[PDB]
Amino acid sequence: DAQAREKLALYVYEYLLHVGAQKAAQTFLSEIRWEKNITLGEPPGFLHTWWCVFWDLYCAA
Amino acid sequence: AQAREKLALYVYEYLLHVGAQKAAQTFLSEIRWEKNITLGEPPGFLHTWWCVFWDLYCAA
Amino acid sequence: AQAREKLALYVYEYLLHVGAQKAAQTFLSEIRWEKNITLGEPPGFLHTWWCVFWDLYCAA
Amino acid sequence: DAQAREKLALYVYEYLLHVGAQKAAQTFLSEIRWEKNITLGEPPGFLHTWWCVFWDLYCAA
């Protein structure tokens, strides 16, 4: 449950960096007082990829 | 491409409901967003989707 | 409850597109289905959903 | 890929038994010439459960 909330934050942060919103990403980590490791993938990152999978499925119904 | 625009909205919603209102404002301005904005109740839809999705993916 | 009725339709579609046309007919008749029926291209929507879902669930 | 197709068939079969369509379930296994093991859960079975999860998500957008 908490592991989920922490992983959403991480992947939102990554998105903000790849979407060209770097200022926003930095302030986001300040506002949630993020004291944990940060491990980054390739653009457009995990959240875009999995969102688009579910979108393609949403638009087929 | 209309997928990317809905994700942006739901992320902006996430940021307000998680108490990252500053980032939220900065976000819209950095992507130069100009469309209309509507939201619902916290925690917001991105959180709702994530909970079932991440429970499916398990992992770390 | 309207969830259960869409699943039935998509299953009836699966059965026709997978070559289980006999089962398909028997199915409708056993649940006493009386609503209108529309389908699309094979393999059908239940297969489409399943492929992304089962790839998420992995398992066995 | 094939593992997926085989697991859909299995879980469709289970559904047909729990939904009160037992004749249909039997003929289904004939028509696909199913020569593999059959392992059954509790009603309403795996496919209903996971369908309803995605439905609840579909009806929240």
Author numbering:
A (entry chain B), D (entry chain B): 13 to 73
B (entry chain A), C (entry chain A): 14 to 73
What did the article's authors report about this structure?
The Chip/LIM-domain binding protein (LDB)–single-stranded DNA-binding protein (SSDP) (ChiLS) complex controls numerous cell-fate decisions in animal cells, by mediating transcription of developmental control genes via remote enhancers. Chip/LDB and SSDP both contain N-terminal dimerization domains that constitute the bulk of their structured cores. We recently discovered that Chip/LDB and SSDP form a stable complex called ChiLS (Chip/LDB-SSDP), which binds to NPFxD motifs within the nuclear Wnt signaling factor Pygopus (Pygo) and Osa/ARID1A, a chromatin-binding subunit of the BAF transcriptional coactivator complex. Here, we report the crystal structures of the DD of SSDP and XLdb1, in the latter case with the help of DARPin (designed ankyrin repeat proteins) chaperones that mask a hydrophobic surface patch of the DD required for its SSDP binding.
SSDP contains an N-terminal LisH domain known to form obligate dimers in other proteins, followed by a highly conserved extension and a long nonconserved C-terminal tail likely to be disordered. To determine the structure of SSDP-N, we optimized its boundaries and succeeded in obtaining crystals for SSDP1–86 that diffracted to 2.4 Å. As we were unable to use molecular replacement with the LisH domain as a search model, we generated 5 different selenomethionine (SeMet)-labeled mutants, 1 of which yielded diffracting crystals that enabled us to determine the structure of SSDP-N. The asymmetric crystallographic unit contains a classic LisH dimer-fold in which 2 α-helices (α1, α2) associate to form an antiparallel 4-helix bundle, the hydrophobic interface of which is strengthened by additional hydrogen bonds in its periphery. A third helix (α3) interacts with its counterpart (α3′) from the opposite dimer to form an X-shaped structure, tucked under the 4-helix bundle. As in other LisH dimers, the dimer interface is extensive (burying ∼2,500 Å2), which explains why SSDP forms obligate dimers, and why SSDP monomers are not detectable (see also below). Within the crystal lattice, symmetry-related dimers associate via 2 perpendicular pairs of antiparallel α3 helices. The resulting interlocked bundle of 4 α-helices bury ∼1,400 Å2, and is held together entirely via hydrophobic contacts, with valine 65 (V65) occupying a central position in the tetramer interface (“α3 interface,” below). Intriguingly, some of the hydrophobic residues in the loop between α2 and α3 also mediate association between symmetry-related dimers in the crystal, resulting in alternative tetramer configurations. We conclude that SSDP binds to Chip/LDB via its α3 surface.
